[PDB]
Amino acid sequence: VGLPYSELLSRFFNILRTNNPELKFRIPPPVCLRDGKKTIFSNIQDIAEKLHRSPEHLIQYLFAELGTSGSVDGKRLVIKGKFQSKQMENVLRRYILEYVTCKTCKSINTELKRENRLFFMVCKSCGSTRSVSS
Amino acid sequence: GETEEEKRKREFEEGGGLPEQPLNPDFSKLNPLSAEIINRQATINIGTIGHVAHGKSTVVRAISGVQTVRFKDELERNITIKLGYANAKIYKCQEPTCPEPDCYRSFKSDKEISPKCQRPGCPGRYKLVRHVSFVDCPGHDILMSTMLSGAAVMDAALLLIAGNESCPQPQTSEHLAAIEIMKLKHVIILQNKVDLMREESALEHQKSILKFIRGTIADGAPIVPISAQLKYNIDAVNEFIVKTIPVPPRDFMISPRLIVIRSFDVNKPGAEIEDLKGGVAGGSILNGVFKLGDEIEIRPGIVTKDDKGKIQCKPIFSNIVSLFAEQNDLKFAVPGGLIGVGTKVDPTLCRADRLVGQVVGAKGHLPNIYTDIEINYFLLRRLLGVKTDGQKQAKVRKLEPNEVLMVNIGSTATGARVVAVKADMARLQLTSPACTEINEKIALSRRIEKHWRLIGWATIKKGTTLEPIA
RNA sequence: AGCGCCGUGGCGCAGUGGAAGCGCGCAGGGCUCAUAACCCUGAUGUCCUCGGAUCGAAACCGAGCGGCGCUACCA
Ligand SMILES: Nc1nc2c(ncn2[C@@H]2O[C@H](COP(=O)(O)OP(=O)(O)CP(=O)(O)O)[C@@H](O)[C@H]2O)c(=O)[nH]1
Numbered sequence: 088v089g090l091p092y093s094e095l096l097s098r099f100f101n102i103l104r105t106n107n108p109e110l111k112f113r114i115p116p117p118v119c120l121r122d123g124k125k126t127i128f129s130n131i132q133d134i135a136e137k138l139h140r141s142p143e144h145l146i147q148y149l150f151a152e153l154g155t156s157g158s159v160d161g162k163r164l165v166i167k168g169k170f171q172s173k174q175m176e177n178v179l180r181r182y183i184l185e186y187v188t189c190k191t192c193k194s195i196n197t198e199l200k201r202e203n204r205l206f207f208m209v210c211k212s213c214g215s216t217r218s219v220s221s
Numbered sequence: 222g223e224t225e226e227e228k229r230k231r232e233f234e235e236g237g238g239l240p241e242q243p244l245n246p247d248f249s250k251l252n253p254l255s256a257e258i259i260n261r262q263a264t265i266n267i268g269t270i271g272h273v274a275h276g277k278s279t280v281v282r283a284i285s286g287v288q289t290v291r292f293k294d295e296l297e298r299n300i301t302i303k304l305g306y307a308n309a310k311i312y313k314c315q316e317p318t319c320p321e322p323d324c325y326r327s328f329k330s331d332k333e334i335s336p337k338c339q340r341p342g343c344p345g346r347y348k349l350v351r352h353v354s355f356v357d358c359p360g361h362d363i364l365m366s367t368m369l370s371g372a373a374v375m376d377a378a379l380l381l382i383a384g385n386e387s388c389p390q391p392q393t394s395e396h397l398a399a400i401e402i403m404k405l406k407h408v409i410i411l412q413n414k415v416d417l418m419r420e421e422s423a424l425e426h427q428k429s430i431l432k433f434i435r436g437t438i439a440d441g442a443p444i445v446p447i448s449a450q451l452k453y454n455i456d457a458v459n460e461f462i463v464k465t466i467p468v469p470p471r472d473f474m475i476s477p478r479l480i481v482i483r484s485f486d487v488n489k490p491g492a493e494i495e496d497l498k499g500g501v502a503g504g505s506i507l508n509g510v511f512k513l514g515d516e517i518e519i520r521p522g523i524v525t526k527d528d529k530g531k532i533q534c535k536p537i538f539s540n541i542v543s544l545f546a547e548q549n550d551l552k553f554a555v556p557g558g559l560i561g562v563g564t565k566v567d568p569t570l571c572r573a574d575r576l577v578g579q580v581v582g583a584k585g586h587l588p589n590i591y592t593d594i595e596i597n598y599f600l601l602r603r604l605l606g607v608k609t610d611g612q613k614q615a616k617v618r619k620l621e622p623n624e625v626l627m628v629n630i631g632s633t634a635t636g637a638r639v640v641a642v643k644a645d646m647a648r649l650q651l652t653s654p655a656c657t658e659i660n661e662k663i664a665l666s667r668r669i670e671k672h673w674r675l676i677g678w679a680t681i682k683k684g685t686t687l688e689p690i691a
Numbered sequence: 692a693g694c695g696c697c698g699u700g701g702c703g704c705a706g707u708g709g710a711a712g713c714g715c716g717c718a719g720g721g722c723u724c725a726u727a728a729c730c731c732u733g734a735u736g737u738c739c740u741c742g743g744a745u746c747g748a749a750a751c752c753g754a755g756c757g758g759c760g761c762u763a764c765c766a
């Protein structure tokens with residue numbers, strides 16, 4: 088008898104429609120600057136906010152993807168190397184795909200935490216515990 | 222201005238605390254729901270089964286709140302070989318006024334006797350209907366001995382199916398058939414992913430799941446849609462467990478026994494050795510009431526090979542330091558719940574996977590180790606766990622003489638050789654020791670496609686015994 | 692959880708017991724009609740934190756932090 092299954096399914100669907108009416112669409116367009124020998128990315132702070140991501144971890148991940156060196160200037164990242172905006176856009180796309188939003192379900196409110204020395208991710212909307220560090 | 226820790230204390234002492242168990246209670250009049258038993262140990266073992274990488278630890282964590290944690294750096298992420306344990310307290314609201322679906326509440330093991338209702342508007346308290354243990358069964362296609370043994374432990378089943386993925390998950394069916402092998406009916410079907418489907422997709426998935434459950438032995442399985450991540454619809458799961466699943470027949474008549482699945486050396490590093498503790502066997506008790514201070518013997522134990530290649534078996538005598546169950550040290554042990562029996566054994570026996578699936582008997586009983594075992598087998602039509610791309614799920618062949626196969630005798634994970642094949646009967650020679658106590662429901666797996674594959678069930682009919690050296 | 696390693700100048704090694712090092716990088720100059728090659732000058736540091744013997748430690752040690760490899764899951 089699967090009758091008392093559809094009712095609690097209905098209850099769950101009403102829960103979903105109550106909690107999450109909106110059911111990412113919040114990625115700032117990475118408008119970059121390629122000044123020949125130099126490259127300046129101003130959007131680094133905005134993409135830090137709209138993805139709820141702390142700046143230092145994001146910029147170190149960017150430096151870990153591509154072996155290029157520079158500095159951080161001002162609310163912007165100043166890397167002296169050669170990259171089209173498409174490729175840094177692609178790197179940000181990878182980081183968005185595998186860090187800000189989980190592959191299994193649509194969510195974003197998760198953030199960095201340190202659970203016995205690495206960076207162990209946890210969520211807020213759900214309560215996840217996934218060991219994503221590298 | 223009370224701190225949250227002060228608030229939680231005040232509620233804990235207000236909830237009756239956790240009273241100490243009586244040292245010597247009259248055991249003839251004790252039932253598994255008794256206040257001394259129900260408050261401080263788990264009387265029913267519920268086991269999680271599901272497809273790989275869908276979430277079975279998370280459902281248990283959402284129910285109780287006790288982390289399986291997951292370990293071994295590399296195993297932190299892929300799969301865990303050992304089982305996952307957690308205790309939940311089942312609390313029902315004493316007020317009839319609150320709706321019946323949400324009155325149930327599953328709390329962690331440290332909750333009080335009667336904690337307050339978190340529903341806004343109900344001053345009623347919670348009564349403890351039962352305490353339950355959870356045995357997280359790994360669901361990988363390579364790891365099969367641990368799943369069979371954890372099954373051999375548990376008494377209630379919990380099936381997880383993901384919605385957006387394909388309906389006929391094969392190793393989920395393998396889990397269900399393994400459950401059917403050991404004589405369990407009480408299975409609750411869970412839909413792990415329901416938020417991520419549409420209304421029509423969820424109904425289609427339910428229709429498919431129902432269409433799968435027509436030929437199997439289990440017929441009236443409850444189906445309930447939950448979410449391990451969103452953490453909702455927990456109370457009705459407790460409802461279904463309480464209503465559908467009663468206590469298996471387990472009283473104090475049967476002689477004492479143990480079945481160890483896990484080994485845990487207790488050697489806190491950095492600490493000086495002059496302050497140490499014994500070796501702990503993580504074992505389940507299906508029969509036997511154990512009290513603080515007892516002499517017990519691990520029957521297969523020391524397994525040696527002489528100069529002549531003969532296997533000598535030395536039982537591990539041991540005195541029980543403590544019977545660690547649930548949260549606190551307990552004066553008596555309840556059958557039907559996994560417990561850490563800490564004994565004087567050297568922790569090097571309980572460091573690695575050494576005491577995984579081994580029989581134990583207190584002093585005052587003589588189980589028999591065997592070397593040849595007569596076994597009565599019966600197989601299914603097809604192998605479970607192979608996604609053939611549309612072509613006739615592989616049919617089980619008839620067994621050959623002299624073939625190494627994994628024969629899970631209760632908890633024991635042994636690789637035996639067939640010395641003779643008959644119409645329904647076989648004889649298995651073992652190099653890894655195995656004992657026989659009563660029947661020890663057995664699972665059979667072959668090596669056809671690299672990793673082990675379940676084929677059918679069996680029960681011992683006879684065997685050639687060995688006399689342990691004293 | 693303990694033990695093996697470490698604490699940049701942008702890097703890697705280093706002397707680590709007189710107090711700022713070497714090469715690779717980068718800015719600048721030199722040679723050349725000119726470029727590369729070659730030749731010279733450089734500014735970068737809490738040499739991770741806190742205390743201690745020490746004229747004095749960055750160095751010699753310890754009451755804390757962070758990052759690395761094993762012991763391996765160490766109720
Ligand atoms: N979207 C979604 N994700 C879930 C749900 N339940 C669990 N997960 C995901 O599963 C992950 C945890 O998986 P885990 O419990 O380790 O899988 P497993 O139990 O080891 C698989 P096996 O039992 O075969 O070994 C989490 O990171 C979480 O995001 C759910 O209901 N919905």
Ligand SMILES: [Mg+2]
Pocket residue numbers: 277278289301303304305357358359
């Ligand atoms: Mg598990």
